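Anyone? Bumping this.
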Amino acid sequence: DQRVSMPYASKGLYLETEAGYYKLSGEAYGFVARIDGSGNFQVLLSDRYFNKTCGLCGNFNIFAEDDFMTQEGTLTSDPYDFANSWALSSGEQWCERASPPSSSC
Amino acid sequence: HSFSIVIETVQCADDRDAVCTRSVTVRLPGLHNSLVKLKHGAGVAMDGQDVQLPLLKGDLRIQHTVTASVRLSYGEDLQMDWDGRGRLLVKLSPVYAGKTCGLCG
Amino acid sequence: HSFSIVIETVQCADDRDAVCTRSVTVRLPGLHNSLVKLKHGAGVAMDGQDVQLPLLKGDLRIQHTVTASVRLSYGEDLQMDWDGRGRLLVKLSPVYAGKTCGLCG
Amino acid sequence: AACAGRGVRVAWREPGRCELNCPKGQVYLQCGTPCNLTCRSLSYPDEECNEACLEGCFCPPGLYMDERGDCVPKAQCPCYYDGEIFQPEDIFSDHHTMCYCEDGF
Ligand SMILES: *[C@@H]1O[C@H](CO)[C@@H](O)[C@H](O)[C@H]1NC(C)=O
Ligand SMILES: *[C@@H]1O[C@H](CO)[C@@H](O)[C@H](O)[C@H]1NC(C)=O
Ligand SMILES: [Ca+2]
C-alpha cells in the first residue's frame, strides 16, 4: 500500500523504464511485462509456463481455440463468462460481474 | 438405519476450492420411508412435494427457526438445523452414540 | 367424473341465517384421485398435506392471485378462484356444457 | 367483479368505503397486469401467461415482488432453479451444469 519511486527492484522483480515505457521484469520467475504510453499492457511468459497457465491471457499452448478456459475448468463460448470467471475480489472492493457495452454501429 | 442424512456438495464459486453444500436429503424408514429434502433458500420438500412449514407428521416435526433456518426433529433423539446457505447442524442424542457412520464418523 | 368440487358450509355469525362456505374440497380422479382442500385463510392441502402454494404437478396448477386469492387450474377445462373468506368462483370450458351436476346445476 | 367479467370496470372504491389498502411499498391498481409481477416471472421468462389485467396491489412499475411481499429491482430478485431458491450473484458449478443468478434468472 506504499507508493514507491521508479526505478525499483525487490524480491527478484525489476521495475524500470525501457524504450520510454514502464517495464516490470521477473525472469527469475520467468515472465516480463510492460505498459506503453497509451496504457496498453503486454506480458511475456517463458516456455516454462507452456500449457501450464490460465487467466484472461489464455492457456499458452499450440491451440488458440481451447483458450477461454474458466476457473471452473469449463470452456465457454462467451468471453465475458471467461473473464468474469477470472475476476479477483479483495478487501479494497468486491466486484460485480461485468457485461458487454451497448452498440449502434 | 432408523435415519440417513445425505448432503449435495457443489462448487459454490468460480474458485476451484470453493465447494459447499447446496442441499440436504433425509431418509426416515420408520416414517413410511419418507424422504425429506432441505433446499437452498431454506425451502423444504417431502417425497417430492413442496411442503409448507410448520409441519408435524407423527414423530417428524419441521419448523422455521428465528434465524429463518429450517429446524427438523424426528422424535427427541434426532434434530437438524439447516440455514439454506449450506450450513447444516445435526444433533444426535446419546441413544445413537457409537451407532453412526458417514462423514460425521 | 373427471372432477368433483365440494363445499363445507358453516354458520358464520351469531345469526341463524348467516351461513357461508368455510372450506372447499376438489377431488381429481384423473390426477391419480388426488384430493385438494382449499382452507380458510387461503391455505391449501393436498392429500391432507399442507403445500407451498405455487404448485404445477401434472395437469393441476395452483397459484397466488394478486388478490392473494388461491387460483387453481386443471388443464384448460377447469379453473377455480378461492378467496379464503368463503368466496369461490368456478369456471368451466364449454367441454363440460350439459355434463355438470350439484348446486351449480 | 361481474362487471369486469362483462368488461366494464367501475371505480367504486373510495375513502368512505372499501379502500384496498396495500402493504408498504406496493401500490393499488384498479387494473394491473399480473404476468410480470413476481420474481418467479423473471426466473421462468419463457412460461406461458395470458391472464387479463385485474384489480389488486402491485409493485411500482420498475420493481418486482419478492417472497417477503417487498418490492425489489430486477437486479435484486432471487432466482428459482429446480424449484430451489438462489440469491443474487449466487454461483454453482457441477459435473452436469454451471450456472449463476442475475436479474432474477
Ligand atoms: C496440456 O495439459 C493437459 C492436462 O491438463 C493435457 O491433457 C494435454 O495433453 C496437454 N497438452 C499439451 C500440448 O501438452
Ligand atoms: C410489466 O409490464 C408492463 C407492460 O405490460 C410494464 O408497464 C411494467 O413496467 C412491467 N413491470 C416491470 C416490473 O417491469
Ligand atoms: Ca490455447
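Late reply, but here is one note on the structure posted above: Chain D touches chain A through five residues (CB under 8 Å).
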